[PDB]
Design a protein around this ligand. Structure first.
Ligand SMILES: O=P(O)(O)O[C@H]1[C@H](OP(=O)(O)O)[C@@H](OP(=O)(O)O)[C@H](OP(=O)(O)O)[C@@H](OP(=O)(O)O)[C@H]1OP(=O)(O)O
Ligand SMILES: [Hg+2]
Ligand SMILES: [Hg+2]
Ligand SMILES: [Hg+2]
Ligand SMILES: [Hg+2]
Length: 410
């Protein structure tokens, strides 16, 4: 029987945290809808038990997958250090790492390593926020406006259909923001009522107004749906086209602020360094987070901006059939090193593993038989590929080295 010509030797997963309750409950969020936002079972920004179950399913799926590729043994707990887990200091990322280990190796006790100071942000997940490095204000401003077509107005203008869909779901017309508006000479509009301005500083970039509000609100509706709440969007979201139209507002903001290279490259540099060393064969040694690398599997519990920053820095673009959110909760950017048996050459494969919005909704258990969705990625900048379309280690290493910003390494 035909034999595999490539042997899996290393896997690095960068996962976004799973389903959580919204991070905030502002007055603005209430003013754009006359209806009352549904309450969540956990504190704001915390992982919901259902969210952990969905992550555990992915962990259960990955265990079957890696076993099939012979990287992990089908029985028992993995050898010490065989599986390493690192998470951002947040409650939701720590819990995502735990839910993943739980699903991957039940009752096996796999440490979830984090930065030691938990009351402080971890620069691995954003070197801009902690001041490791700074953004070039003028250059970032030009790059974002450039990707916006010259102006934020023209940008939102091309997405009015999506903004009106959101208004419809909110019953924006009967919101206090609308009824208490002084220029009632014109129809009430989110984009009109909340002008979006681009804010850029050394440590951050943002969009004020309807752009950021809509990105947050549409993500909240996806969260309600994934959380299994009765009627997400107060029952006003009734079909797939609406889900896509709504979430496009979310993907639109990430395209501008997280994928733009002038931002992404600096923001994803620490992760690029970690991913590269973890995938590069070399003498194992205890290091960051007390983790020993290289090893067989490395699971990194991060955030959606991390996935988007990595996509922009590596020029990895994707769309996920069945999942309106390009960087969905639990979504995994999977990096794998395969060794070609023929000449023992090294190769890197990249894919985006995710659960469809329905798989989240029905909380469906995953397995090789009922697997999550997966999109194989192509490194836009790679030249040397193998028969399977993977990039050589050398090629991959070159792309990472050209994409990272030295000033932003840890
Ligand atoms: O870590 P935080 O300080 O709590 O910031 C969070 C986090 O963003 P980051 O990727 O930069 O960490 C969320 O991403 P996830 O952890 O859920 O993957 C994001 O959620 P969404 O962009 O998907 O909505 C949310 O944004 P939001 O304000 O809309 O809740 C945002 O909050 P901040 O805007 O306050 O930073
Ligand atoms: Hg540790
Ligand atoms: Hg190392
Ligand atoms: Hg996202
Ligand atoms: Hg998201």
């Amino acid at each position: 029987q035909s034999e595999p010509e490539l042997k899996l030797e290393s896997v690095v997963i960068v996962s976004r945290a799973g389903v959580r309750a919204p991070t905030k409950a502002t007055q603005l969020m209430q003013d754009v809808t006359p209806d009352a936002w549904p309450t969540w079972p956990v504190k704001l920004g915390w992982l919901t038990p259902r969210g952990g179950e969905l992550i555990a399913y992915l962990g259960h799926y990955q265990r079957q997958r890696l076993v099939a590729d012979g990287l992990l043994a089908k029985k028992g707990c993995p050898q010490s250090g065989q599986v390493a887990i690192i998470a951002d200091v947040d409650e939701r990322t720590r819990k995502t790492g735990e839910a993943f280990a739980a699903g991957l190796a039940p009752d096996c006790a796999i440490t979830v390593h984090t930065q030691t100071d938990t009351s402080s942000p971890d620069p691995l997940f954003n070197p801009l926020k902690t001041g490791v490095c700074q953004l070039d204000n003028a250059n970032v401003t030009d790059a974002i406006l450039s990707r916006a077509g010259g102006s934020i107005a023209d940008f939102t203008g091309h997405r009015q259909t999506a903004f009106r869909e959101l208004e419809r779901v909110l019953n924006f017309p009967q919101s206090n923001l609308c009824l208490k508006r002084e220029k009632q000479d014109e129809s009430c509009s989110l984009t009109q009522a909340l002008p979006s301005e681009l804010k850029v500083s050394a440590d951050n970039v943002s969009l004020t107004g309807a752009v950021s509000l809509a990105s947050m609100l549409t993500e909240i509706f996806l969260l309600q749906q994934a959380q299994g709440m009765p009627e997400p969007g107060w029952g006003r979201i009734t079909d797939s086209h609406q889900w896509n139209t709504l979430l496009s507002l979310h993907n639109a903001q990430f395209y501008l602020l997280q994928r733009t290279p002038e931002v992404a490259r600096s923001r994803a540099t620490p992760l690029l360094d970690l991913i590269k060393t973890a995938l590069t064969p070399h003498p194992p040694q205890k290091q960051a987070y007390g983790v020993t690398l290289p090893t067989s599997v490395l699971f990194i519990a991060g955030h959606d901006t991390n996935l988007a920053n990595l996509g922009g820095a590596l020029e990895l673009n994707w769309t996920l059939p069945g999942q309106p959110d390009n960087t969905p909760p639990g979504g995994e950017l999977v990096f794998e090193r395969w060794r070609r048996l023929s000449d023992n050459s090294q190769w890197i494969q990249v894919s985006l593993v995710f659960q469809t919005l329905q798989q989240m909704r029905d909380k469906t258990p995953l397995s090789l038989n009922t697997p999550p969705g997966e999109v194989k990625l192509t490194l836009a900048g790679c030249e040397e590929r193998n028969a399977q379309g993977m990039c050589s280690l050398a090629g991959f290493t070159q792309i990472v080295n050209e994409a990272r910003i030295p000033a932003c390494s840890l």
